[PDB]
mmCIF file of C-alpha atoms in Angstrom:
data_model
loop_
_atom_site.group_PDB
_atom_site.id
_atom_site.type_symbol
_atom_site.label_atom_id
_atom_site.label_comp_id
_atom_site.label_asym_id
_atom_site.label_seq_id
_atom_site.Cartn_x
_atom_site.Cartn_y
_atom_site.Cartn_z
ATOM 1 C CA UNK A 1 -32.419 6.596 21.804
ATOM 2 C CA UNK A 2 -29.120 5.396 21.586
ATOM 3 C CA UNK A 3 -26.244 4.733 24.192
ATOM 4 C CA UNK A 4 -22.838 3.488 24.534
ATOM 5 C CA UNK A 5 -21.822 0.558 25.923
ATOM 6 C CA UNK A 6 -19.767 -2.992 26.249
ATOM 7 C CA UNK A 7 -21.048 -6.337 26.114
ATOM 8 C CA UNK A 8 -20.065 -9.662 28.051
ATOM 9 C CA UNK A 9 -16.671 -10.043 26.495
ATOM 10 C CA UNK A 10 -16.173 -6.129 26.870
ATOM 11 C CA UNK A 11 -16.365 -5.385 23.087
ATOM 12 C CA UNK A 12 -17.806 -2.076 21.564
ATOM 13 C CA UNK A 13 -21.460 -2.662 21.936
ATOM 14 C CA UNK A 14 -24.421 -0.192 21.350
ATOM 15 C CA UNK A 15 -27.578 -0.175 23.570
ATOM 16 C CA UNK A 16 -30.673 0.404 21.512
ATOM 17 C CA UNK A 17 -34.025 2.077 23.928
ATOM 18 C CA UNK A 18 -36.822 -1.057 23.448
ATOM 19 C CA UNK A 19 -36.247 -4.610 23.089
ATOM 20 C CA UNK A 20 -35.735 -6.742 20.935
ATOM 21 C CA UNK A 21 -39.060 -6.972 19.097
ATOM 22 C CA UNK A 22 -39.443 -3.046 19.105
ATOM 23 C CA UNK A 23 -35.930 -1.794 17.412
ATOM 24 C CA UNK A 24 -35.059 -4.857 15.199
ATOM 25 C CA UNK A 25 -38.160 -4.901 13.504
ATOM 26 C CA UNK A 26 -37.778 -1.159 13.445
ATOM 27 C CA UNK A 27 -34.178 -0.807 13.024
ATOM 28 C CA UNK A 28 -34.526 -0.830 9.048
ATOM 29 C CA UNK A 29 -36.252 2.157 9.640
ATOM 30 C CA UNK A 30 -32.767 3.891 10.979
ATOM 31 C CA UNK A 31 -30.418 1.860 8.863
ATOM 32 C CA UNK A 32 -32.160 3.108 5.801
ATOM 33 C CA UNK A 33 -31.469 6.653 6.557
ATOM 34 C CA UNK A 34 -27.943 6.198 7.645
ATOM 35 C CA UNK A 35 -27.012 4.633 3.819
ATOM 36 C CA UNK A 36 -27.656 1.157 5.097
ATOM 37 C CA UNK A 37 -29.705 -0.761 2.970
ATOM 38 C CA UNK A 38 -31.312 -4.020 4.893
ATOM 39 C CA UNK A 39 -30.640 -7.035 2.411
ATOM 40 C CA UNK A 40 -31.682 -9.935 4.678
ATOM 41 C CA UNK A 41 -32.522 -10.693 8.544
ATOM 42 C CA UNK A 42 -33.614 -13.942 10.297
ATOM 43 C CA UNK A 43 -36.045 -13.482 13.449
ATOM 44 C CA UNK A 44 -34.884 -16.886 14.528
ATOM 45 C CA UNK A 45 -31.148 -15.883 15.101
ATOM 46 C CA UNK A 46 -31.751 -11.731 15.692
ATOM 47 C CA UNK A 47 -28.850 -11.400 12.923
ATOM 48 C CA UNK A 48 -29.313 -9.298 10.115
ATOM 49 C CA UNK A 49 -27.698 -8.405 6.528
ATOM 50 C CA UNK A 50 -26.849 -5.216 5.318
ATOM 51 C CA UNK A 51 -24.754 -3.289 2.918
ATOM 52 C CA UNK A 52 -23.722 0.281 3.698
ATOM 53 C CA UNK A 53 -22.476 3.023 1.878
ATOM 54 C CA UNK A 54 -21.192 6.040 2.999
ATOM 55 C CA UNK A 55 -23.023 9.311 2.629
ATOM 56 C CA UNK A 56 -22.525 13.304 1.155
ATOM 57 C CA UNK A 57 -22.189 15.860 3.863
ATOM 58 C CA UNK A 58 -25.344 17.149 2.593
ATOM 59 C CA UNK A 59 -27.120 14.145 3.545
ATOM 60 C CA UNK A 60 -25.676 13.881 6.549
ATOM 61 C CA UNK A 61 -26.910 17.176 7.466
ATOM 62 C CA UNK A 62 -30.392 16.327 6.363
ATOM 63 C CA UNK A 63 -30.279 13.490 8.770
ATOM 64 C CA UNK A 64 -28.659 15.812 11.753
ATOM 65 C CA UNK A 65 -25.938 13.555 12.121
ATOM 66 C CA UNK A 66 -21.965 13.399 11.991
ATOM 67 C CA UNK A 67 -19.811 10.908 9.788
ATOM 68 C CA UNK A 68 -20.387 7.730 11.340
ATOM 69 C CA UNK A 69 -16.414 6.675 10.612
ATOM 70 C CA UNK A 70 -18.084 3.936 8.558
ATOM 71 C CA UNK A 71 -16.555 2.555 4.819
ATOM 72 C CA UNK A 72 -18.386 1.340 1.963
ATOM 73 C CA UNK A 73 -18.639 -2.980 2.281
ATOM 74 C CA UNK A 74 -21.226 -5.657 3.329
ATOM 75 C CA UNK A 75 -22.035 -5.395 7.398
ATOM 76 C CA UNK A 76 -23.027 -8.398 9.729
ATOM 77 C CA UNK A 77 -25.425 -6.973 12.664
ATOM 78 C CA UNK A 78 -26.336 -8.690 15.662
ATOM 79 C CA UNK A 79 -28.888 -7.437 18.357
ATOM 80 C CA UNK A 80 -29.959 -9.276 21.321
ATOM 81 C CA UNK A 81 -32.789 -8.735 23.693
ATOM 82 C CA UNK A 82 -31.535 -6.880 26.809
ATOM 83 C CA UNK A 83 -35.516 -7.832 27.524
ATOM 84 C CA UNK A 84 -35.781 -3.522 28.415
ATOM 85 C CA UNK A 85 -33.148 -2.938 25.839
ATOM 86 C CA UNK A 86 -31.721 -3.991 22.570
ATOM 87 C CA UNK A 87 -27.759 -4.868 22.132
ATOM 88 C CA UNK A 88 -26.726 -4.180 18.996
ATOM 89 C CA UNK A 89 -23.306 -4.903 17.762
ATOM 90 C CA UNK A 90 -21.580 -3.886 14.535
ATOM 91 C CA UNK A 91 -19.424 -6.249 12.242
ATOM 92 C CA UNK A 92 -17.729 -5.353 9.869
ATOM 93 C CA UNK A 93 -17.136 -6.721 5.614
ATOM 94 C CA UNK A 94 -13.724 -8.398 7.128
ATOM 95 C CA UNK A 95 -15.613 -10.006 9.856
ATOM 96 C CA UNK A 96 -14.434 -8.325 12.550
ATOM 97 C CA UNK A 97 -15.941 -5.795 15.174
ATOM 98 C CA UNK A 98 -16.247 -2.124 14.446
ATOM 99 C CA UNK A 99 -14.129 -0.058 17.344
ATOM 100 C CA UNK A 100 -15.499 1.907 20.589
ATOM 101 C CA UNK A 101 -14.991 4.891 18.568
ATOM 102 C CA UNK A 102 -16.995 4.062 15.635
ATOM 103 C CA UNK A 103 -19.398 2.808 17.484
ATOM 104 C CA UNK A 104 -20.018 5.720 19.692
ATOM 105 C CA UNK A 105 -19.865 7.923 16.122
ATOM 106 C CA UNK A 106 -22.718 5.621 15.516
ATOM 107 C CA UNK A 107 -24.319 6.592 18.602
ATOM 108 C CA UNK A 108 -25.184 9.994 17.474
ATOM 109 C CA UNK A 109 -25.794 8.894 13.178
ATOM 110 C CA UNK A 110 -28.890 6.526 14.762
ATOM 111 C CA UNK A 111 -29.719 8.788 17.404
ATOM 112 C CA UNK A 112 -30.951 11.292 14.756
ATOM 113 C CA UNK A 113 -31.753 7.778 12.336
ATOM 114 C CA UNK A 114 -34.624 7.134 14.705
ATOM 115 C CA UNK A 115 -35.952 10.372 15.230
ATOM 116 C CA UNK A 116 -35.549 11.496 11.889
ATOM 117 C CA UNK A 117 -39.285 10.550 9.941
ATOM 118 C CA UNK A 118 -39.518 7.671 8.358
#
């Protein structure tokens, strides 16, 4: 399950249900099926290393999700341990954060990511 949500400095922040060691080690899983491919990740930091690229409607549909408002590039992803939870935050190729509303798009994309079989 995925929820929206803001972290300490009030940026766009995503709240991912099981901590740390259950969706990071997990989250692959998801980012695979929402056309992000997991190049690297380092356990020591919780940061990982992906590059994304967007999806056909048609594959969108097979995932039961919408578009997550997400362009083609590299992405930086952080997730902390909320110790219940996991906070996972989106950066994007310009090394900046993605917005609230991309964010909660993404809500939805990894809601069905994590569900969907895999």
């Amino acid at each position: 399950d995925v929820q929206s949500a803001a972290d300490d400095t009030g940026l766009p922040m995503l709240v991912v249900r099981g901590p740390f060691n259950v969706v990071w080690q997990r989250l692959p899983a998801a980012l695979e099926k929402v056309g992000m491919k997991v190049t690297d990740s380092t356990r020591s930091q919780g940061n990982m290393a992906v590059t994304y690229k967007p999806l056909s409607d048609s594959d969108w549909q097979e995932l039961g999700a919408s578009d997550p408002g997400l362009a083609s590039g590299d992405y930086k992803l952080q997730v902390g341990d909320l110790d219940n939870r996991s906070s996972l935050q989106f950066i994007d190729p310009k090394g900046h954060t993605l917005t609230q509303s991309q964010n909660d798009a993404l809500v939805a994309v990894f809601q069905a990511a994590f569900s969907k079989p895999g």
